[PDB]
């Protein structure tokens, strides 16, 4: 809801809270 995630490095989706503005690969 609050997290954005797209592919990046490595191959992988990171989600990227657009309101915290907290963008890694972990469990939001």
């Not at 809801?1 to 939001?28: A, C, I, L, V």
């Amino acid at each position: 809801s609050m997290w954005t995630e797209h592919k990046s490095p490595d191959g992988r989706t990171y989600y990227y809270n657009t309101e915290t503005k907290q963008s890694t690969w972990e469990k939001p």
